[PDB]
Design a protein around this motif. Structure first.
Motif, PDB file in Angstrom:
ATOM      1  N   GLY A  58       0.926  -1.339  -0.114  1.00  0.00           N
ATOM      2  CA  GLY A  58      -0.401  -0.096   0.422  1.00  0.00           C
ATOM      3  C   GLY A  58       0.620   0.594   0.479  1.00  0.00           C
ATOM      4  N   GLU A  59       0.342   2.008  -0.914  1.00  0.00           N
ATOM      5  CA  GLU A  59       1.320   3.816  -0.563  1.00  0.00           C
ATOM      6  C   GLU A  59       0.619   4.622  -1.036  1.00  0.00           C
ATOM      7  OE1 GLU A  59       3.698   2.010  -4.574  1.00  0.00           O
ATOM      8  OE2 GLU A  59       4.952   2.231  -3.055  1.00  0.00           O
ATOM      9  N   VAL A  60       0.445   5.086  -2.343  1.00  0.00           N
ATOM     10  CA  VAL A  60      -0.871   6.015  -2.228  1.00  0.00           C
ATOM     11  C   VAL A  60      -1.668   6.048  -3.064  1.00  0.00           C
ATOM     12  CG1 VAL A  60       0.999   7.161  -4.167  1.00  0.00           C
ATOM     13  CG2 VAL A  60      -0.492   8.805  -3.217  1.00  0.00           C
ATOM     14  N   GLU A  86      -4.213   4.356  -2.633  1.00  0.00           N
ATOM     15  CA  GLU A  86      -4.737   4.181  -2.059  1.00  0.00           C
ATOM     16  C   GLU A  86      -6.468   6.012  -2.115  1.00  0.00           C
ATOM     17  OE1 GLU A  86      -3.122   2.591   1.068  1.00  0.00           O
ATOM     18  OE2 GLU A  86      -3.837   0.921  -0.176  1.00  0.00           O
ATOM     19  N   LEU A  87      -5.356   6.613  -1.703  1.00  0.00           N
ATOM     20  CA  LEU A  87      -5.793   8.244  -1.433  1.00  0.00           C
ATOM     21  C   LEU A  87      -6.394   8.873  -3.277  1.00  0.00           C
ATOM     22  CD1 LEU A  87      -3.962  10.365   0.348  1.00  0.00           C
ATOM     23  CD2 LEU A  87      -6.092  10.438  -0.810  1.00  0.00           C
ATOM     24  N   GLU A  88      -5.492   8.296  -4.210  1.00  0.00           N
ATOM     25  CA  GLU A  88      -5.793   8.639  -5.871  1.00  0.00           C
ATOM     26  C   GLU A  88      -7.394   8.039  -5.167  1.00  0.00           C
ATOM     27  OE1 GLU A  88      -4.534   7.574  -9.704  1.00  0.00           O
ATOM     28  OE2 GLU A  88      -5.663   8.355  -9.572  1.00  0.00           O
ATOM     29  N   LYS A 140      -9.557   6.712  -3.662  1.00  0.00           N
ATOM     30  CA  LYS A 140     -10.848   7.080  -3.688  1.00  0.00           C
ATOM     31  C   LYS A 140     -10.900   8.853  -3.470  1.00  0.00           C
ATOM     32  CE  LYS A 140     -12.866   5.622  -0.025  1.00  0.00           C
ATOM     33  NZ  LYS A 140     -13.675   5.373  -1.060  1.00  0.00           N
ATOM     34  N   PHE A 141     -10.242   9.851  -4.145  1.00  0.00           N
ATOM     35  CA  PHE A 141     -10.706  10.651  -4.665  1.00  0.00           C
ATOM     36  C   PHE A 141     -11.356  10.800  -6.564  1.00  0.00           C
ATOM     37  CE2 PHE A 141      -8.795  14.945  -6.319  1.00  0.00           C
ATOM     38  CZ  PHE A 141      -8.961  15.277  -4.775  1.00  0.00           C
ATOM     39  N   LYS A 142     -11.244  10.290  -7.079  1.00  0.00           N
ATOM     40  CA  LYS A 142     -12.222   9.819  -8.172  1.00  0.00           C
ATOM     41  C   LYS A 142     -13.215   9.483  -8.124  1.00  0.00           C
ATOM     42  CE  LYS A 142     -11.878  10.144 -12.628  1.00  0.00           C
ATOM     43  NZ  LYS A 142     -10.950  11.120 -13.735  1.00  0.00           N
ATOM     44  N   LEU A 174     -15.244   9.378  -4.906  1.00  0.00           N
ATOM     45  CA  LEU A 174     -15.940  10.273  -4.380  1.00  0.00           C
ATOM     46  C   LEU A 174     -17.094  11.357  -5.362  1.00  0.00           C
ATOM     47  CD1 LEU A 174     -13.973  10.718  -1.201  1.00  0.00           C
ATOM     48  CD2 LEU A 174     -16.553  10.357  -1.480  1.00  0.00           C
ATOM     49  N   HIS A 197     -10.912  19.285  -1.019  1.00  0.00           N
ATOM     50  CA  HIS A 197      -9.956  19.242  -1.881  1.00  0.00           C
ATOM     51  C   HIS A 197      -8.837  20.828  -1.534  1.00  0.00           C
ATOM     52  CE1 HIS A 197      -6.790  20.043  -5.447  1.00  0.00           C
ATOM     53  NE2 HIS A 197      -7.363  20.860  -6.007  1.00  0.00           N
ATOM     54  N   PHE A 225      -7.187  20.840   1.322  1.00  0.00           N
ATOM     55  CA  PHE A 225      -5.757  19.432   1.511  1.00  0.00           C
ATOM     56  C   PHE A 225      -4.625  20.341   0.772  1.00  0.00           C
ATOM     57  CE2 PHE A 225      -7.694  15.562   0.338  1.00  0.00           C
ATOM     58  CZ  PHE A 225      -8.327  15.691   1.388  1.00  0.00           C
ATOM     59  N   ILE A 275      -1.264  21.114   3.046  1.00  0.00           N
ATOM     60  CA  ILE A 275      -0.067  20.639   2.724  1.00  0.00           C
ATOM     61  C   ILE A 275       0.563  21.600   2.847  1.00  0.00           C
ATOM     62  CG2 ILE A 275      -0.894  18.706   3.143  1.00  0.00           C
ATOM     63  CD1 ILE A 275      -1.866  19.207   0.626  1.00  0.00           C
ATOM     64  N   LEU A 328     -12.188   9.767   2.021  1.00  0.00           N
ATOM     65  CA  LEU A 328     -10.967  10.739   2.025  1.00  0.00           C
ATOM     66  C   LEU A 328      -9.481  11.398   2.411  1.00  0.00           C
ATOM     67  CD1 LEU A 328     -11.638  12.126  -1.458  1.00  0.00           C
ATOM     68  CD2 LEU A 328      -9.296  11.608  -0.747  1.00  0.00           C
ATOM     69  N   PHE A 344      -5.853  10.815   3.479  1.00  0.00           N
ATOM     70  CA  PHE A 344      -5.109  12.334   3.866  1.00  0.00           C
ATOM     71  C   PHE A 344      -3.675  12.237   4.781  1.00  0.00           C
ATOM     72  CE2 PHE A 344      -4.762  16.360   1.750  1.00  0.00           C
ATOM     73  CZ  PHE A 344      -3.964  15.829   0.827  1.00  0.00           C
ATOM     74  N   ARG A 364       5.260   7.441   2.821  1.00  0.00           N
ATOM     75  CA  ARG A 364       5.643   8.203   2.740  1.00  0.00           C
ATOM     76  C   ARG A 364       5.003   9.591   2.535  1.00  0.00           C
ATOM     77  NH1 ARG A 364       3.900   6.047  -2.095  1.00  0.00           N
ATOM     78  NH2 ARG A 364       5.443   4.161  -0.579  1.00  0.00           N
ATOM     79  N   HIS A 401      -1.562  15.664  -4.372  1.00  0.00           N
ATOM     80  CA  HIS A 401      -2.827  16.805  -3.599  1.00  0.00           C
ATOM     81  C   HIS A 401      -2.768  17.651  -5.379  1.00  0.00           C
ATOM     82  CE1 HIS A 401      -4.170  20.040  -2.603  1.00  0.00           C
ATOM     83  NE2 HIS A 401      -2.841  20.896  -2.938  1.00  0.00           N
ATOM     84  N   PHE A 428      -4.769  16.346  -7.898  1.00  0.00           N
ATOM     85  CA  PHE A 428      -5.819  16.998  -7.487  1.00  0.00           C
ATOM     86  C   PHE A 428      -6.355  18.520  -8.185  1.00  0.00           C
ATOM     87  CE2 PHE A 428      -5.404  13.156  -4.220  1.00  0.00           C
ATOM     88  CZ  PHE A 428      -5.753  12.314  -4.303  1.00  0.00           C
TER      89      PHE A 428
END
Lengths: 35, 35
Positions: free
Chosen positions: A1-3, A5-7, A9-11, A13, A26, A29, A33, B6, B10, B18, B26, B29
């Motif tokens: 598992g890396e990133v 997962e976040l991507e 869940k994005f498209k 939602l 967004h 976000f 960060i 989501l 995050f 990472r 992001h 996004f």
């Protein structure tokens, strides 16, 4: 598992459940960060 | 289930796995949903 997962869940939602509330997060976000 | 999923994925990717790759997504996004 890396990133991937976040991507996903994005498209997922935007096209499925609500959407205006997702893109709103967004913006948060960007203030979460910064860049 | 709404958008809390989501958001959690995050802050969980920045503080755990990472991080540079997460904030990079992001930026994607921003070009993914525009504003």
């Amino acid at each position: 598992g890396e990133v991937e997962e976040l991507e996903k869940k994005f498209k997922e939602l935007w096209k499925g459940p609500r959407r205006g509330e997702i893109e709103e997060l967004h913006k948060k976000f960007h203030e979460l960060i910064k860049g």
